[PDB]
Symmetry: C2
């Protein structure tokens, strides 16, 4: 179809190397891209086998604005086992702003942050 | 793997009927969810066959904050033929803030807005 899919969503970070370490080694994402360009570096990470990728943006990126590092990202990540994933991420040092919580809405959600305070929703669907 | 994929991204709109009409009818997205839960309506739209969905949210959602309606969404949408897509969307009344142009480091992109001024990048990789 005309528009096939959502390719990427931007997440803004203070340090791409530190963020790559977080997203890949602690969250378990794949490092999808890491290519120099201007001074700029294009960094993409994504859950293994997933279609849409997160672009880890610094400033220099024309897409950035002040306030974009360390906000609620409005992104909802999906897990098949929120209990296990919560426990494992906490073990690796991840800050959960809200622990797993059963929903009326069926399934269960939680909220966590990356090291810059970028906040994600974590969902096990019904 | 603990996290399987990005399920959803929020986009904030003034009127969900109108936004449905734009995303579903004008952009060609599938209406994935449309459920009333009291005074709030859960609406999801996504490109056909695509994994991640857009949740069409309002002012009255707990995830809302002042200024979230009508901004650059930080979303790149993918097309295999940006010339064709651009021209078709223009025929359908879509306002492009930037026409397609070759990127310095490969590919081509453009940017357009929904009726509330939410802005998307459109990319032919």
């Amino acid at each position: 179809h005309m528009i096939s899919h959502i390719g990427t969503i931007d997440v803004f970070v203070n340090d791409q190397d530190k963020a790559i370490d977080f997203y890949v080694n602690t969250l378990g994402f794949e490092l999808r891209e890491d290519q120099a360009f201007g001074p700029m570096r294009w960094v993409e990470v994504a859950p293994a086998g997933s279609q849409t990728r997160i672009v880890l943006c610094t400033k220099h990126f024309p897409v950035y604005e002040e306030g974009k590092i360390g906000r609620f990202t409005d992104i909802q990540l999906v897990t098949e086992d929120i209990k296990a994933t919560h426990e494992e991420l906490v073990r690796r040092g991840v800050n959960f702003t809200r622990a797993p919580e059963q929903m009326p809405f069926g399934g269960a959600n939680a909220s966590f942050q990356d090291p810059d305070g970028n906040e994600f929703l974590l969902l096990q669907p019904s």
